[model samples]
Target chain A: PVDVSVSIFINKIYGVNTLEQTYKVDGYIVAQWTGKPRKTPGDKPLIVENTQIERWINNGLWVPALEFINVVGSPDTGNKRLMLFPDGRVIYNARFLGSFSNDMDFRLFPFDRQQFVLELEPFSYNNQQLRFSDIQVYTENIDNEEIDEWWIRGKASTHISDIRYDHLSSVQPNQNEFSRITVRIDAVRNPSYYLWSFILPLGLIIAASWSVFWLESFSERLQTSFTLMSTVVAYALYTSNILPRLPYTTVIDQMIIAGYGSIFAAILLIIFAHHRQANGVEDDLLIQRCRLAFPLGFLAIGCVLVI
Target chain B: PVDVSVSIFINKIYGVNTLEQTYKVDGYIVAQWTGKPRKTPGDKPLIVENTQIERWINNGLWVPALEFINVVGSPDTGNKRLMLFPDGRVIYNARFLGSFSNDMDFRLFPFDRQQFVLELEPFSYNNQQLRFSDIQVYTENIDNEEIDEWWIRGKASTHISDIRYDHLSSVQPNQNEFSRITVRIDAVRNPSYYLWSFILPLGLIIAASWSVFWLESFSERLQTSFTLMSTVVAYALYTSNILPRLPYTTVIDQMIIAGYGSIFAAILLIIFAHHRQANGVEDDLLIQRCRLAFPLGFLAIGCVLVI
Candidate 1:
């Protein structure tokens, strides 16, 4: 048996799906093994294909199945390659695109710190035999990886341990026990996309939502709120198209709901403040001041939302 | 060796997560076996707890590791019981909550016929025999089920075959093949939620959106669309809150985007038709007629949409 060494170089990782409990990872896997030098019929190194490498994995050969530990779902596998060096070093390289499983509550997604992790273990091995293994992970700088979907920074702290799970085949006493290698990477928020697509547009729409109280005529004020409601709905649709689907509501989602509630509340107040009078001549100054009052009240409420 | 007969009763099967490739299943499992008569302890049959059952599985007692063939992920188990009969017959009853794996694309979720599937086989052995297997999948009436999340009709079909996944433990010769039981359930669309929450509200919002063109003044017309735009955004957010997320756009998603395009397009035309002229008096009668023209134009476009 030849001793093999493997290293995975991660390019970028992003798209944390909270509902699905998964994340996307873009990276390359490099595997090297020393072997007896052999000559090819065409005076070149012998080329082994993917099918053969997989065959090796199935034949009781201990191949590590490295899973994205912090991934929400499962990873999507992309382009793959297997390389054989002239000096008997076998290198297996593959670009994996997978939605990995993780425990995440993205109700606060955009401004959340998602941990990107990888779980590595020899597929069918006991703890004693697989105990003497080590892994080293490298994470590139955020500045360099900024052009991608996620701005990935620091590398993960390495951990080696034995993990016991509840479900397994009925065989050995320790059949459910497996040696685990964990690599965790700290990630900061890539606020660019959310800032441009959601935050700015949302602010503009919310500012516009408040303008419904500014119209002079009751017909214009009441009628315009319906239009205001429709606009808020449209903005909500735009947000839905871009944001991830989650079981629970997000911060942005709550804000959208608040916008609707604010406009609807203003419509009720405007109509009530207008009609709730003995005659048109009484002219309550406080009610008229609501033009400024409602706007300021909404602004005050909006400010409190920052807390 | 005792002969064991197994039957699985499927209850509610819904919540198909497309991106995660996982589906949720709530059901029951029944396993019955006959064993040699033994002396009762304290006039009652011995009751084994979950911890003991797990201990038994670890001791290689030949308990069949039945798998959910069509399940996307692992199933979550609920209440369980091992009923002992006076005549040495053992019956195992348990309620399970699990997310099974299947190839499902929920881009058209509410209107899609999602299949709930399960795969069963002996985990470790190729020839651990099962006397007979049966599945009772409950089906509700079409109209009744439509009100619920997923509609179930009947047992779709059942097949017993040898499935060869190119990716497996090892390359085994003919004798190592395993037997697989595949169960499929056919379902229909549940359009109630989408009809009320999505279709009707969207139509109302879109109809109100056209009112932006009704204002007599240019400022009213121009400024009104901004609010209209914001309303559309709000509506979109509501849509996002209720609907499932997909990689590609959906029918409703397309409609929301189209609404944006239509309003934006009208804004351009409305502004151009009024302001882009040499003399203020040079207003084109045909262009101004767009107030009536667009309503009819919209009707014609709406007709085409249904077709």
Candidate 2:
């Protein structure tokens, strides 16, 4: 079996879409294989770049098509180059920018940890013919995590293994296996923006909603509760406007729902306390004492949601 | 004067701090200069990577110290590689990540255009000793701008110019001139986050404040005005909590103040309608009709503020 070594140099990973579970990636892919030695200009590697690469490919150059399994669609390939070393080493290098897919879970949103993956395999070759010897991934932005939205935690991990396809083959034994390279890059969301911009502001709005209990008159409390309810709705609209479109609720979304429920429950209690009076619609001093109870209750509920 | 050609490959631009007026940059810096030819094991260029570069410098290799003029501090330099060609061409390539300072104006923030710059010059050599020949910038993320926070527009502009110092000189001719390479990358704010997250919600709150005029009773109108006032304050706190800490006000900041003024004006009108009455205290139908007047007046004022 002919062995091929693959090296991926990831320059940037951005445009993470929570709803789509996709991310844009820009980088270089290098594949090296060995063949019979050929003559060169001066016993040096023959450098072929861009348009010349296609010309050489047309001239009977043996270049394998390695497919990206996780890419959403066709990637925009740029600057394809070939280096033909005299010692039989043929290196193919190309630049690519594409949207890649993954099973991304953003339930925690700002505090979410995500794994970006890239899967590579020979399109028409089985392991018995062409095998992946090794795979290397170079995350160029390793030392400068702040240069991107997600802070990449560690070096990218790689696995060069054989994939056995049981359904694809009916008779052949070795033809069922294909060489595949999997690259995984783990990262955490940079919570700075969301912590201050989104979460903190949301907390302030929710906490301010509780100030309705502090009002003196029952009339004042009920009217102000209506205004607070409107305020929370406006805040919810704002969060939905700016945040990533998600199929499922995020931590912030749940917090917003909690805000709605808290104000709504208070509204119901305020009205109930007024009409559920003994003689007339008099304010209940006991129910009004729920000022502290509601806050602690919401806090407890928040802890439960976290757990 | 010795001529040096510089090429920069920008990988990413992020961590833009509005308050500090600084941004993080990650890229490869390549400087090529011709030196006296040297014998090599092969006719090809000799490769020197990382630690061996310092060793070569110690061995009297003529490597110049190029300084980043606008860098906030010492940059984190990585992977210093030197390609020594037998034909006397010495190419110095290194990876650098650093915080760069710029004169940033966030007055129109979320809609503002910004420019990222890099200034390179010889640390000690004057133009008479060393001069910059040309500069080339390759924005690697050009095809995949979705992979970055800022969408870099167009190719990076570069200039190889000479800076003549007027001071720190006695009577030496041409001794004050220093060679400098300036690169400018213009970009527009994504604005998607701020527009939906901050601006839209704020507009909703302000527009909702006008609902106070539609209340039936004088007591409801007056009481609801206070709640609206508090809501605006809460919204302000949210904006201030999340937005970039700026010394001066931004467009959103001005909009928030407008919300306050609108609600405050409504409160004064409601109170005036009650107290400034023909009898002891009566709501004036003529002045109460100013509900339309207040909204129009505020809209006109908003237009003026934009102008």
Candidate 3:
């Protein structure tokens, strides 16, 4: 079995999509494997560029193809090169931009954790044939969080293992298993934008909604509650227009729902206090005096949501 | 005059200090100049590392020193290397970390624009003897803004000009003018952190303060104003503890002062409404219905502050 060593230099990982569950990756891929010794100019390593690699391959260079199993479509290939040493080591290097797929949960978006992954395996060979020996990933170590929308937690995590397939043609002992290289880079979303623009404003609107209890007259209290509810609706429109759309609701969406419910609950209580009277439309002093209670109660509920 | 070519690879620019007006820079500097060709092992370029460069200089190799005029103090230098090409080109490379000084205005902090600069001039040699021909700054092009605290706008701007000094010993024709290479990189504050954490919370507190007017009774309105003022003070303390200390007030500081004034103004009105009566302690109906007025008034004043 041929032991192929893999090295991936990740230049950038961006253009993350929530709906599509994909991310764009731009980087260089290097695969090093041993080959029979060949004569070179002045006993130095022979460097073959893009076009020459195809020519060399046609001339009986045993270069094995590696496939990105998780890639959404064909990659945008950049430069290609072959570094052949006189002592029987051959290194095939190529630059590529690929859109890779992953299962990402953004329910806690703005504070969500995600991992960008890459899966590399031999195009046609099994583990019993061309096997992956080791893998090295270079991240360029941009160690600052505010530098991008996502904060990369640390170095790239790499693994070399066998992927077994039960539905392969003419499978034998260990023939259905293919050697694979998996690289995972963990990151967290930068929640600053969402915090200030979405969460903070929503919180203030909700807090101000409780101000309906401070009104003296029944008409004033009931009328102001409608406007506050409208304000929450306007805010929901603003939030939905700007935020990323997903099949499931995000943290911000849940807060907006809470804002609506709180106002609706207050409206029910406000009307009940006025109508549930003894022979007169009299406001209940205890319910009207709940100016501070509502604020604290909503805050307690918000805290509970976090826990 | 010998024309020297300058190249700077900026690895990182961080540790920006607000009070001191300084920022840290880490990168490699490459200066190339032409000299008489010397013999080397075979015909290849001779590569010399840190200690060898010092040894070469001791043997009359004529290596000139460069100074960073705007640097706060001496820089922390790292690797030093000399690439002696047989074709008369001598390249000197060194890694350095320096605290650079700049006149930065942070009045509109969180949305402020800043520039990191590097000034390179010969330490001892004047322009008549050694001059800068051109400068090239390699920024690694980390094109993402959220990746760091500051969003780099574009490529570094380069300038090759002469600086004339009036206070130089033994002044001669063109001897006082020193060749200088200046590199400037423009950047804007990431602002996401400040927007969500500082500005948003403060805005909520200010908005919530207006709720004091919603109280039905005079005592309720006046007493709640005091607590609101206390809340502003507590928020100020929280802000002061976390925010970077500056000699003058920032945008957030000004907003805090406005919060205090708004609450205080509401208190005076609440008290005067009850006392400013003809027969007895009566509340002013017009002044008491300022629940909507105060929020709009403060918002109008806030807009004025922006202009």
Candidate 4:
């Protein structure tokens, strides 16, 4: 049995897809293992090039078939090389761009936390043939806080273990237990773009919607509510155009709903006050002025939506 | 040089993520090429299953690398088999599931037409070295119309050609051209779910919203408008929650905007009739009953947004 130590250097992660349940990662993977000790040509570790490695493969050198378990399609492998040491330690390194799948829930979108993950497991090999060592993770640039979409939290997380497949027929009962390496990168959504572009404009539109109550004449006030409704509709249309696609609504979607509701409520109450007069003098002095409380009250009520 | 004929059997295609620009496909693939006539075990066709094919691979038999160029990650290969014909034809068959990426536009959203596509290419071979025969595509079942989310418009589409990568290397002028097989499946989204569950309920909400124009007093009119605004807000939230996310507004979203306009316009005119004493006691009796025009007029305007 041979022991392999793996390391991952994550350069950039982009294009996270919710519907496809995939994320694109650009990085390098390194697998190092010990071979039979060899005499060195001089005192330095030997470097093996790509074309010559196939010659080594032909000579019965063990090259473990490591597969990315959660990768959506085959990864595009780039720039592979081997580092051979005089003491028999051999390292294989390659750059890759692959889309990996993960089960992500967007129920609390816009403020949701996510852990981007990658799984590495040996193909057609069991624990008796190959065992994995502790994985190491490295990130190139951080702390300056320039990334727009996602915020990387901590350095990174790693796990090494054996995965047992019980369903394999006539397979390696113990050998079916494959050595595996798992990587996780914790990230938080950077909502500045959504907040400034989507939410702030939405809040301002709703605020303008309430100013309709300040107009002169009952007819004008009522007509203005219709206009307010139209503007709110336009705002909703614009909001839907810019936001990311999802099967579920986001935090900002709820805020826009509140905007539309308050305008509708204002219209209903304006008409109701004219009809609900008990004393026949039909004074609406209190009802029109009651409009001041809608905005402030809706804010507190809207803020309390259960996540 | 070898000529390989590839055929794909598409079983099921579902789960298109507009945001991720990705789709899932489950299918079987077959690659057949002529080899030197071989001595057959049964004098017909000798079948070599899974693990034993590695023996032929090790003995100088060339198995062409067929790659899913647009696939996001590695496909999950299910079953693999090799058939050796006495007439010198060699066949390789395998089943795979993959999430593939494509350049897609969702400007039409719910009512959009899309062609789910697959690109198969020889990874390391040029067109002159590895010529490809035409590809065949088939769809298994269509009569029952059981699939709900999307409607398949055709059985399948096929195209086999050569693609040249102009900027591959300084050495390659036209040598980088490779054999490629492209498959397309035309589909249309089933808007029944969105139309009934989303649009129908939304229409009812807007119809109830306009009845505010039938109310009695000014206080009722003005105050009711506020409540009406809030209702629109609530409806917007509900609609946005259940609908698929998109970077562009859909026909349904446009209808939602129209709903906001009708209600707001009603409110504006409600106040205008009371205070526009320029005509003195006009009472807006006939003008206030403009509810029927809202839906019909918006339809003309809304039809323009339909894809």
Worst-scoring 10-residue span by lDDT in model 2 chain B: B128-137
Chain A TM-score per candidate? 0.72, 0.92, 0.94, 0.88
Per-prediction TM-score, please?
Answer: 0.53, 0.60, 0.58, 0.61
- For each candidate in turn, the interface RMSD (Å) is 10.5, 11.0, 14.5, 7.7
Please give the distance, in angstroms, between residue A292's alpha carbon in candidate 1 and its true position after superposition.
34
Q: Give the TM-score of candidate 2.
A: 0.60
Stretches off by above 4 angstroms in model 1 are A1-307, B1-6, B14-21, B31-61, B69-74, B78-93, B129-133, B167-171, B276-278, B299-307
Question: Which DockQ values do the candidates obtain, in the order shown?
Answer: 0.08, 0.02, 0.03, 0.08
CA RMSD, predictions in order: 14.6, 14.8, 15.1, 10.6
Displacement of the residue A171 alpha carbon in candidate 2, Å: 50
Badly placed stretches (over 4 Å) of model 3 are A127-142, A171-174, B1-307
Over the stretch A1-307, how does candidate 2's per-residue lDDT look in tens digits? 6788888888778888674567988998999889888897999899999978767655667677677766754578888999999988899999999877767777677898999988887754564233443434455444665666777776788888778844341227446788888888888888878899999998998898898888887777777776776678667657755777543456887787677678777866776666676886576768887988889998999889888
Task: Return the clash pairs for model 3, or none.
Answer: A146-B146, A146-B147, A146-B148, A147-B146, A147-B147, A147-B148, A148-B146, A148-B147
Question: lDDT by residue for model 3 over A30-101, one digit each (tens)?
Answer: 788878999977785766755456778888998888899999988876557787888888888776777999
Per-residue alpha-carbon lDDT of candidate 2 for residues B137-182, written as tens digits (9 for 90 to 100): 4454535433234666757887778888778567586588888888
Tens-digit lDDT track for model 1 on B1-307? Answer: 3355778887877777654556777888877777655455675776655546655434433244455544433456777666655567667777888766555545454577666678776443454455567888675556566457776765557766665533222224543556676778876667777878887788777777777767776557667677667566777777767776554445676566556656765666655656567888353446655766666677777677557
**CAPRI band for model 4:** incorrect
Clashing residue pairs found in predicted model 2: A197-B242
